[PDB]
Design a binder for this molecule. Structure first.
Ligand code: BR
Ligand code: BR
Length: 357
């Protein structure tokens, strides 16, 4: 991708020369945990991992973090400093700086994702972007601190304002209105860096329709995100297979035939109607449950622009980051095997045709 920040135009993400580009990467989680740094540095070197990502055709790293990362003085834990000698004596944020810096040198971009408030493993137990101790005020101010820190670094292209706010609502104006909260944090971040992409995930349910956490983007049609800087909003659904949860739209034979219409109903319509870009922030599978393959086959085809999954498709297709680069995800696994080095080729076969080239 051409150097400099990005922008949106219709359902397209454009580089600094007006050319449509595509973000096709992986999730590298860990910085939201108690260690305060992305996982795997207890056995791998951080430059070797980024090079391996780029060598597999990926160009984007979604990096989850926790609010607690921005206020802790604890040193990072777990890093093997024999294998990562350049990270010796660095703070948790300084290790993030090192990772972002090298990723830009390797031709990759970075999306920061507020995964949770406290240090933990996955999605916030609250289903919200705040709790009784980590306020929405501090969440907004923390996004301003991050925007300031990477204001002059176009490697950091976008802010994923919050991971899966499945207990928020799309509208209503109250304290749990995720659309209001996202517009508040988006404008606060854009006031410091107006060149950031503002990545807004969906909720969990909307007018009685329940979908994957983060993948319920049905509210955009009647109440879209409106920020004080134009051409910055990217919508980010999450989608997963039967092995993660036995959803009703996976049940019964011929379920795969109705998956394209299901993708379009919850979030895909935003791209098809040229409303805004679509960047699915999470999706993964171990490819053991046979229904998982039917889902991934339909999903990858839909993301490519084959909205009816028949075979027919100067714009780019939908952007995406796979869950995960890490192997240590219990339900989905990742791109790397448990040894944190071996590539799972059976997943790469699905991903390579929809990577940005
Ligand atoms: Br090193
Ligand atoms: Br933890």
């Amino acid at each position: 991708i051409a150097p400099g920040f990005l922008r949106t135009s219709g359902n397209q993400i454009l580089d600094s020369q007006g050319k449509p580009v595509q973000l096709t990467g992986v999730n590298w989680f860990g910085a939201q945990s108690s260690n305060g740094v992305p996982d795997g540095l207890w056995t791998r070197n951080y430059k070797d991992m980024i090079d391996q990502m780029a060598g597999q055709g990926f160009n984007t790293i979604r990096i989850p973090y926790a609010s607690a990362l921005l206020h802790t003085n604890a040193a990072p834990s777990g890093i093997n400093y024999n294998a990562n000698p350049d990270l010796q004596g660095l703070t948790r944020m300084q290790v993030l700086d090192k990772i972002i810096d090298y990723a830009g040198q390797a031709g990759m971009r970075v999306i920061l994702d507020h995964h949770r408030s406290t240090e933990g493993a996955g999605t916030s137990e609250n289903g919200l972007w705040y709790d009784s101790q980590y306020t929405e005020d501090a969440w907004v101010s923390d996004w301003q601190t991050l925007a300031t820190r990477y204001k002059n670094n176009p490697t950091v292209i976008g802010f994923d304002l919050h991971n899966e706010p499945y207990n928020g609502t799309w509208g209503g104006g109250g304290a749990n209105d995720w659309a209001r909260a996202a517009e508040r944090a988006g404008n606060a971040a854009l006031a410091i860096n107006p060149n950031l992409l503002i990545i807004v995930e969906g909720v969990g349910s909307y007018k009685g329709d329940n979908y994957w956490w983060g993948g319920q983007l049905q509210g955009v049609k009647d109440r879209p995100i409106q920020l004080n800087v134009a051409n910055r909003v990217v919508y980010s659904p999450h989608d997963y297979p039967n092995s993660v949860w036995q959803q009703p739209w996976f049940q019964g034979d011929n379920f795969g035939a109705g998956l394209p219409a299901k993708f379009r109903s919850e979030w895909g319509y935003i791209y098809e109607q040229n409303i805004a870009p679509i960047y699915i922030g999470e999706f993964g599978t171990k490819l053991i449950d046979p229904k998982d393959a039917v889902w991934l086959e339909a999903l990858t085809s839909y993301l490519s622009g084959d909205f009816d999954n028949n075979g027919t498709i100067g714009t780019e297709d939908m952007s995406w980051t796979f869950w995960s680069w890490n192997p240590n995800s219990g339900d989905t696994g990742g791109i790397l095997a448990d040894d944190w080095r071996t590539i799972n080729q059976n997943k790469m076969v699905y991903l390579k045709p929809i990577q940005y080239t």
